[PDB]
Amino acid sequence: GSLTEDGLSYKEKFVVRSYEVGSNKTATVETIANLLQEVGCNHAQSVGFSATTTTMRKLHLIWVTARMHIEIYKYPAWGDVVEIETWCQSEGRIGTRRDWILKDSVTGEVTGRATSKWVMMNQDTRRLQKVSDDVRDEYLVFCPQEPRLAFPEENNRSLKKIPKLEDPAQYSMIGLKPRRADLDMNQHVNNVTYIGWVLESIPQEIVDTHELQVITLDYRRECQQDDVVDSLTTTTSDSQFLHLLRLSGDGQEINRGTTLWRKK
Template identity: 80%
Template sequence: MLKVSYNASDQLQSFLTSFRPLGPAKSPVNLLRRRYGDVSCSLARRAHAPVRAVVSADQGNPVRSEPGTVASTGTVTGTLADRLRLRSLTEDGLSYKEKFIVRCYEVGINKTATVETIANLLQEVGCNHAQSVGFSTDGFATTTTMRKLHLIWVTARMHIEIYKYPAWSDVIEIETWCQSEGRIGTRRDWILKDCATGEVIGRATSKWVMMNQDTRRLQKVTDEVRDEYLVFCPRELRLAFPEDNNSSLQKIPKLEDSAQYSKLRLKPRRADLDMNQHVNNVTYIGWVLESIPQEIIDTHELEVITLDYRRECQQDDVVDSLTAPEFPEETVSELGGTNGTPRGHEGTQFLHLLRLSGDGQEINRGRTQWRKKPSR
């Protein structure tokens, strides 16, 4: 059997060399600059420049190194994926930024990114942040102690506000950071920007709690676990939503069974399961939207979504999605006014409930706010 040996740098160098006959004006870097402007961390610089390396000092304590740092073997660390990602830690090292191109399979009928795409990118950049500072690739930002004790992070609450949806081929930058929530868990925030204009197009915040992967029971965060990730958290409270009256803090009342709209007996697909062996939190967003009335989908776009996760969902579970206007006196046909919002209310709001079809146990409760689709 023929054995071929190569490394990531050789593979990437060969890839870039294949573009050279096109000439300088048509190089990958210049094509990117002409299409997207001055995008930092270009492909060519990633190929030839040292990357921000992550070195494990004692197989347990992650160490963040500066650009150009090399491992004890004298070679620059970092995978091919590390070199290709348009990413960086901020100057203080306590938040992380990464750029993404919106792809054709990530947009919906309006040729703009879906809310599920946005939520997936938030999850991706959060995981990449954790990996960039040395946390495990075996789970969602698990520390050394967590892996020893079979502990994982699970989503308790997610709040996303989208001011402008990016379109197909747009380049967006997402900044993220995390901070402690004491014994309860951790908080992770995000800010989304349009790279072409620098405009903030969205913000998000989330809360995560620890669960034992074997017993599926929640556990308090120990001092040992907190000490492992606090070194990478801002020293002072940093919030994506600093306003005292922001909607991310609002409680969500439980929707009763007599919901106006429903989509019953939704079943998880195999592809909906994640590495923690349960339905991924982004799937819940799709289930919530399944019971939104078609009249709203046709004329409005989602502006705000808040989800409280009550219990995990397994592959064999069957789920009911229930939806009703948050203000009972309003119906979908009465969403009047020139801007399409209910009279007397700011925005078109719905309450949501995901429950098990069999015994009615609550899985998730949510709230969504919608605005009229912009003319394009």
């Protein structure tokens, strides 16, 4: 992959692998989510971030996901080349935004798009801080100056408020525990695991007859390596669902989201 001519976005092509595909012989949403992370990470390295700034490191500050929104029109088939373009944008003192565009490498058609909101947190106290002037200056030089949104439409699904699922849930998957392959290089549970965990409570008949079109996820708390999770789902309707990930014991909310599925 490489940064574009202007140095304000990054592009990378991926060939879909045999183990990356589902029952339909196309990449899973978890494979797509892993690819968004890989292209975002390679963009971070290409601009010297490797995604902390020097001032964030001298202050024990880290970027954490608050919201992730993915919309897939066409899942690439096993063997196809998917091209992904990604870029970051400052949102004042609120935080950063990272956007992605997925294209079919042969036709050039847009096959998917994602948006993510990131916030500043102290790595130690976990207290969230508003972005200071110094951090914005270190970041803005690698961002487009004019707004560039993967989801520009007036009143779009990427900015919708998500409600809390009320008990009893229609469907559930209980006792989910993260294994070592669910941890990143810093021993934290990876964001992709939560997507898989949310989808575990969707009935197999829905999965077999429908394709996932949209997924919006709100991150409230991190799941530890020793925590046990319950995944809950209720139909709110195309088929639409409301989801909730909470700790098995105390019931502390860790995630909430919505999914939209189209008939095949």
